[model samples]
Target: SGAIYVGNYRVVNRHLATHNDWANLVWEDSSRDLLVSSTTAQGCDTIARCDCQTGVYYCSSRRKHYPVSFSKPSLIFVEASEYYPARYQSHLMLAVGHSEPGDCGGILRCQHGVVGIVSTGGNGLVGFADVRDLLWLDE
Candidate 1:
């Protein structure tokens, strides 16, 4: 017999566009700071950092996403340069909505309402593994 398994993490969206594969994600013991890093065999690298307090993620110096309305709450970056610089001149942003995926655009800039920064190789390659950290809020 087969059984349906439920994950501690919720599914952000069922129709979201998936990336080739993201780097392993790691987090602080307290689960306050999260670091997600990924690298392609060709040397392309990407990283995303999240602040649980605010529930926002900085997916490198060129990408960002917030899972305010998302169930699993994640940020995904599809592509980037080989080095994944902290301050790059180019990058792209993809927002995974509850029902659809959307692209904001490239070019990093601080603006009204939201403040986002690109994640550099330094941040993206930090202590990472093929595992995601989980926190229990009801504890």
Candidate 2:
């Protein structure tokens, strides 16, 4: 896995799952008081919020909150994959190829879109993906 810059944040792969059941995407830049979460609520099927107060980043969910810490308050990406069960035709795979050190974690660099296969009950590494085409709106 190698480093890729998502805006000003350097990101890499960190975890993988068979299904997109858990929280999987995170971007935190405390310098600008930014903390983003693409995580699902516990025991529910709704997207959760990542809130920051002074330092810790918290995942606000159903009756519970999970806090995550960073090393130097820089932009970081994280993936905490949940459980997924399926086979070839209907399964999700997460993998990490190549490696390099970054401010947050290991970054995975892919030229063309990379595809991986994960066996049932198998866990994968956290990796980075190109989000250039993804839409983002502030405010």
Candidate 3:
């Protein structure tokens, strides 16, 4: 998790699920022309590298971290523990962060581009696992 810049894209791979199961995935060194859910039947979720320090996140207020608009899908939530992208559909963002769910692998952004990440949340919703369900993105 190194590179930055998201408005014009430059994210570089990041897969952080720890002990596994909270599933997060980012990748954007190059190569991206997604949106083949059987030819535009619906939505989407990119970018990455590793050793990850900062190249992702959401939430604001007294904490002040407001830089977003990935073009679309993002709505994670975790208050006292702090995490809030706040806003989606089947990509499961669901206007998130009213509070709580252990930050399940968290790394979500959108403005109508990439597609994939997160594994679970209590009820505010979160359970995206696309990029064609983990590369094989078209197999």
Candidate 4:
């Protein structure tokens, strides 16, 4: 899929990040960190930590299991609009029109309460719904 940006940001890269069964640490931004896991030690299955000031994510430990699936279907013939100064960071939301396991209808992102285009599939469609900073969807 693809990613979107809301406000002005200097993206370091557009690569995908995944965690193992135990735990992994990754930088979400300068301050925030993400800690993703499959099976929690005491209670939960996954854990993520973020810094309030910066958007860096930190993973706690490491595991053997493969990372979770964050893949989505692909959408076709989508367009990109270039706005000055990049006012908002893009966030992506998928709405499966049908009941099929992965028959998701479209992915959406909005600004000022106005949703943008609908991607049919999930390929190359990331970072659509960005909040105040460049924080992506938590799902």
How well is each residue in 1-139 modelled by candidate 3, as lDDT tens digits?
A: 1222333222222232122211323332111211221222322324332122112233211132223223232333332213223323232333333212434334444443344434344554334322323333322
lDDT of 1 at 6: 17
Q: What TM-score should be assigned to candidate 4?
A: 0.19
Q: TM-score for each prediction? A: 0.17, 0.20, 0.22, 0.19
TM-score of 2: 0.20
Which parts of model 4 are misplaced by more than 4 Å?
10-94, 98-107, 110-139
Instruction: Kindly give the stretch of ten consecutive residues in candidate 4 with the minimal lDDT sum.
Output: 57-66
Tens-digit lDDT track for model 1 on 1-139?
0000112221111122124212232212112112222322232112223322222433333344434221222333333433332222222232332211122111121221122222222332211111122323111
Residue 89 in model 3: lDDT: 24
lDDT for each residue of candidate 2 in 1-139, tens digit (9 for 90 to 100)? 1223333232233332113312444553322212334433222211112222112111121222222221211233332224212212111223332212221222112223211111112132322222322234111
Cα lDDT of all candidates, in order? 0.23, 0.25, 0.30, 0.24
Clashes of 4: 51
lDDT of 4 by residue, 1-139 (tens): 2222222221121223233312333234211111222222333111122212212111112111111112222222323322123132223333322211122211232222212222222343322222223233223
Error of 4 at 80 (Å): 32
